[PDB]
Amino acid sequence: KQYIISEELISEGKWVKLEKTTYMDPTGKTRTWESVKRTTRTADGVAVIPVLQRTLHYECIVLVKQFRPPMGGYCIEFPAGLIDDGETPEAAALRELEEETGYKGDIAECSPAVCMDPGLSNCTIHIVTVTINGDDAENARPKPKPGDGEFVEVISLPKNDLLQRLDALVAEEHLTVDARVYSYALALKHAN
Amino acid sequence: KQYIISEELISEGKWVKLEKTTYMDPTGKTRTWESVKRTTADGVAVIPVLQRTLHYECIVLVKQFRPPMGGYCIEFPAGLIDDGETPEAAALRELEEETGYKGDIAECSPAVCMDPGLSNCTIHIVTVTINGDDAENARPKPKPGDGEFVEVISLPKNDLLQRLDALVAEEHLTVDARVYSYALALKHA
Ligand SMILES: C=CC(=O)N1CCC[C@H](n2nc(-c3ccc(Oc4ccccc4)cc3)c3c(N)ncnc32)C1
Ligand SMILES: C=CC(=O)N1CCC[C@H](n2nc(-c3ccc(Oc4ccccc4)cc3)c3c(N)ncnc32)C1
Ligand SMILES: [Mg+2]
Ligand SMILES: [Mg+2]
Ligand SMILES: [Mg+2]
Ligand SMILES: [Mg+2]
């Protein structure tokens, strides 16, 4: 009993547009929302949850540090990015993971499309859990191949103390942790 | 190394604005980005663990219509922090408004980013326990904000990822990425 009635363009940039969304609320009253959408009419992207498994060591979660212009600061994130021209989620996952980290991994699982920020945008991603065989030579000396203007520092953090490692990074190096990463670190503790 | 050079307004809405951000890259080249912003940390998301004697713990989630998405999304209770409000007060207030439960603080994250490729939106993630043995959390009544309409869905922590998968298979609705990320780690632990 709620639905979109109309979308009116407010402002279109190269990558991102702002829209006045009109919609019916449940009382039968009409209401507006300001909404963001891409200029490029599938989920939009993938985030990879990369579990670096090496025997006789803790499993690690591989994260990336990048400068994020909207945040005007460095942010710690799961490797992620846009699914490219008719490409599958899984394959965008391995690719992004290689481009961003150098690791070559195997799919363990793939989420349905999930919303990034539904109070603001219609951005959806697939979250893909990937195990990295860290005892295979391909992953011995992993080589990041980042595309034009992509500057990405890898940080692998033990999965055993993930939440504590994340909080320490915020307290020390004043960077921001992504909410999906934080959510995952929390649940590792909460499963107790 | 890298830093913001300038922010030039493209368009101002009542609530959100689009800006052209110019930043210094690490090679020392000037670059641009399109960034969304509002007109502390903006908000809270509540992780509500319903605890009851002789029950498995539940995670309390809300279903709401999300205009940006064109349909209904399953979320952690979440809302903006009012001026002068603490994250924890907001968390508890939003939880009660959205679900009817009165919770107790367990923990509060640092500010974390929602969508850093797009906005500077940050939240605190606030873990709250709900004493479901207490008489006030027996028949909880939502008291939603102005133009706010919520259904409550409580799922066992010990089965969250599977129960979310079911809901997505049976209904026409999206799970939020933070919810789905939490359900995954539960299974991975
Ligand atoms: C060469 C490579 C490259 O630079 N790329 C790769 C190709 C273009 C990328 N891009 N595109 C974005 C962007 C797009 C989508 C975003 O979320 C969504 C929003 C609404 C609905 C769905 C998703 C967020 C951000 C972003 C920007 N706001 N400004 C500047 N450019 C950046 C960057
Ligand atoms: C129930 C409550 C209520 O009705 N309110 C009263 C209070 C105002 C609320 N509001 N505001 C928003 C909004 C603001 C910012 C958003 O993201 C960002 C947050 C921080 C930094 C960057 C981005 C997303 C959404 C939203 C809208 N985009 N359209 C229309 N109004 C809605 C509406
Ligand atoms: Mg990326
Ligand atoms: Mg990438
Ligand atoms: Mg809310
Ligand atoms: Mg609310």
Numbering used by the authors:
A (entry chain C): 14 to 54, 58 to 208
B (entry chain A): 14 to 52, 58 to 207
Wording from the paper:
NUDIX hydrolases are conserved throughout eukaryotes, bacteria, archaea, and viruses. Their name derives from a common substrate structure, nucleoside diphosphate linked to another moiety X.1 The characteristic NUDIX box is shared between family members and contains a sequence motif “GX5EX5 [UA] XREX2EEXGU”, where U is usually valine, leucine, or isoleucine and X is any amino acid. In particular, the nature of their physiological substrates remains an object for debate, e.g., NUDT5 not only predominantly hydrolyzes ADP-ribose (ADPr) to AMP and ribose-5′-phosphate but also exhibits activity against 8-oxo-dGDP, 8-oxo-GDP, 8-oxo-dADP, 2-oxo-dADP, and 5-CHO-dUDP. A recent systematic exploration of the NUDIX family confirmed that both NUDT5 and NUDT14 are able to hydrolyze ADPr and ADP-glucose, yet the function and cellular roles of NUDT14 remain elusive.
Using a combination of biochemical, biophysical, and intact cell NanoBRET assays as well as X-ray crystallography, we confirm catalytic inhibition and cellular target engagement of NUDT5 and reveal an unusual binding mode that is independent of the reactive acrylamide warhead. Surprisingly, we identified ibrutinib, an irreversible covalent BTK inhibitor, as a hit. Ibrutinib is an FDA-approved Bruton’s tyrosine kinase (BTK) antagonist used for the treatment of various cancers including B-cell leukemias and lymphomas. Among the compounds tested, 1 stood out as the most potent inhibitor (IC50 = 0.837 ± 0.329 μM), yet the other two acrylamide-based molecules 4 and 5 also exhibited weak activity (IC50 > 10 μM). We next confirmed direct binding of 1 to NUDT5 by surface plasmon resonance (SPR) and determined a KD value of approximately 200 nM. This suggested that no covalent bond was formed between the acrylamide warhead and the protein despite the presence of a potentially accessible proximal cysteine (C139) due to the acrylamide moiety pointing out of the protein toward the solvent. Similar to previously determined NUDT5 inhibitor-bound structures, the main heterocyclic ring of 1 is stabilized by π–π stacking interactions between W46 of chain A and W28 of chain B in the active site.
